[PDB]
């Protein structure tokens, strides 16, 4: 019964048309992709020696915010689920950084390229920092002056947007339906008139423009729901969507589990 | 359980400040001097001026935590178009032949003013009002 007609697709941005679903279910899925989809982000930073002019908390928190290419973050075990003392590779990808400036007058631009993935449990390709792309030399991390050094090691562990926006698989997810307010969910507040003061959505062409004669059916419920999902490069749109679906499935499965567990 | 039965021709309607409800005032087709004023959700069952509506005042619709309305419980309501539940809040035992029964249906006010005995049986607490077109 769940029906989708994907308008457009891309590595990060996707516009989908999920029809024949519940509004509450659709919102729950949107929340799951926004917060409960796991990614990899730096959660521990050691500064071995630093001669820059910036705080180490600054650079550490920024490093945490950096998305890491995380198509396989599911295989990574949690720092609390994994039984090992301290960190092992299976629950922790190690990153490294070492940069210097020597040219006196000048500045060495430390980029996320300098963040070198020096671990990652074979294979489990998680931990390499996301960038715009290859020609882009990476996310800029620091600016080095005469005789200034950044030497850092990093521990990245599996995480979600719910515990930090640095693990957030998405920036924002657009969720829409009823592109003409034919279901009467918003007032069209107005100073002169309601239909003309309020524009027509990009999905106005998709569903029918409401018949002026047609009296509102007080039993119809929202059925066609438009979705727009974007990722930061740590994951892909399809990955985030599927992970959210499966995560809410396993949430319901555990709810079952505890239901018959209590009885 | 259909204590009172009548049909009314609607003479006036006004929404005013309220948009989803209009107060409607009509005279009874069956017998004049029987005036019916009722606040109605317009978009849910619309009526207009001079509209003839089949009004029934019932003491009991069952022929208590309200449940999703089960079709297994038949209602005289199903015989009508707009059905509205309320409480008779004043039985106006006034004029010689003008009982003015005021019933509040959760806020929607109704005045049935007319015959003394024709409305005397309406000396109840709650009320079901049932409307065919």
């Amino acid at each position: 019964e769940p029906k989708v007609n994907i308008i457009n697709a891309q590595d990060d941005e996707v516009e989908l048309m999920l029809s024949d679903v519940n509004l509450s279910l659709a919102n729950s899925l949107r929340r799951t992709m926004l917060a409960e989809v796991p990614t990899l982000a730096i959660d521990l930073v050691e500064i071995k020696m630093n001669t820059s002019v910036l705080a180490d908390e600054f650079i550490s928190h920024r490093l945490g915010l950096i998305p890491l290419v995380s198509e396989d973050v599911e295989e990574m075990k949690y720092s609390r689920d994994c039984t090992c003392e301290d960190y092992c590779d299976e629950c922790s990808v190690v990153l490294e950084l070492s940069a210097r400036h020597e040219g006196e007058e000048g500045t060495t631009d430390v980029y996320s390229s300098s963040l070198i993935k020096v671990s990652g449990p074979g294979n489990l390709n998680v931990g390499e920092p996301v960038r715009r792309d290859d020609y882009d030399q990476g996310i800029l991390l620091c600016k080095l002056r005469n005789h200034q050094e950044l030497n850092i090691r990093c521990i990245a562990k599996k995480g979600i947007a719910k515990e930090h926006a640095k693990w957030s698989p998405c920036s924002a997810i657009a969720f829409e339906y009823d592109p003409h307010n034919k279901l009467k969910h918003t007032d069209f507040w107005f100073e002169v008139d309601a239909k003309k003061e309020w524009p027509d959505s990009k999905y106005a062409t998709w569903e029918e423009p409401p018949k002026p004669g047609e009296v509102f059916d007080y039993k119809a419920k929202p059925n066609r729901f438009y979705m727009t999902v974007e990722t930061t490069g740590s994951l892909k749109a399809n990955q985030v969507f599927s992970r959210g679906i499966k995560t809410l499935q396993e949430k319901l499965a555990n709810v079952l589990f505890e239901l018959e567990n209590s009885r | 359980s259909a204590l009172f039965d009548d049909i009314f021709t609607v003479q006036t309607v006004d929404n005013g400040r309220y948009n989803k409800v209009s107060r409607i005032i009509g005279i009874s087709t069956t017998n004049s001097a029987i005036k019916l004023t009722l606040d109605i959700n317009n978009e849910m069952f619309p009526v207009s001026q001079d509209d003839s509506l089949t009004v029934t005042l019932a003491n009991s619709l069952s022929l208590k935590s309200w449940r999703p309305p089960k079709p297994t419980d038949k209602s005289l309501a199903d015989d009508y178009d707009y059905v509205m539940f309320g409480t008779v809040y004043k039985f106006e035992e006034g004029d010689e032949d003008k009982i003015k029964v005021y019933v509040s249906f959760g806020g929607l006010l109704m005045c049935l003013e007319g015959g003394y005995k024709s409305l005397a049986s309406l000396k109840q607490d709650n009320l079901y009002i049932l409307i065919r077109r």
Binding site: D187, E191 | R23, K64, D81, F85, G106, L109
Partner: protein, 339 residues
Amino acid sequence: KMTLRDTFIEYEQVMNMLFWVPSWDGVVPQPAILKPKPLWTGKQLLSIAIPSGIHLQRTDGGNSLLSPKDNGMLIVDGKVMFGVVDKKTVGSGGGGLIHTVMREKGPKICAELFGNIQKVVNYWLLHNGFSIGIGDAIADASTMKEITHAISSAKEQVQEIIYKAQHNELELKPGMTLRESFEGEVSRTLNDARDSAGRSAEMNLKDLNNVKQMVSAGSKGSFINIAQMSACVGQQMVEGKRIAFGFADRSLPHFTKDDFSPESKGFVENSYLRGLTPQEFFFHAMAGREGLIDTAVKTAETGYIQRRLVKALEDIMVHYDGTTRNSLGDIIQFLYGED
């Protein structure tokens, strides 16, 4: 926004607030609307949060029994018959619902009803929401021009009073000297200007307008507030006076000597929407600093007043006899409040 006649709620939201309502008996009553679809009204939701055994009845503005405006007030045993509950009843007003629970049920029941209404309102607004916008604060151009012409007419009346005073044609008011009569009557005229403009703006406030909805809700704001924001601020009255000519026979070097016209003496010709001219901006600065200095000064004297009054009567107590006496036993009054 809730008690209104055309407020409609559906089974799911109903049941959700019922679970939210602390004073719900697990039993939802029959919805007022049942067919062709069961729908619920604001009054029944109110009565759900209300524990039974509370009746109230107040005719409002001489309203009738059929209450077309949903005005008036009638709660029966915790069930609202007609009338929208307002701050005149849910606030601290005497005879109010809180007064009623004080004098019928006690303080615990009032604490319960506070929680009831607070949580159900949290739900209902969380799900609806109510806001404010610039379009709410603006009225159509017709009322804007009514405002403009009201101010202009008041200015013309001011100029007429100026001419009468400047040629002694102004008839002397009782206990009010000629120049001061001029100043005071012009003050009255310009306050009438601001109030007329404001009342026009209030009239042009619309139903969806969250501004009139704010004042009618009464959560904050008032008439004069809208008058100043939308129509015009009006004369900056300091300690019940008018902004005088601070310089030599002038209030600003941009005005002239004996510039009896309003702009040179502190009457605001703009609203908070429009923004104010530098001269009258400085005049509103006059009024604002006046208010702040009034507060700051009044602090210390009101304080020592309070302290000395507390010192004055620190031991008056009604003894078990019922007579009000001193520590000496000399009776001030044989009974408390004569009763």
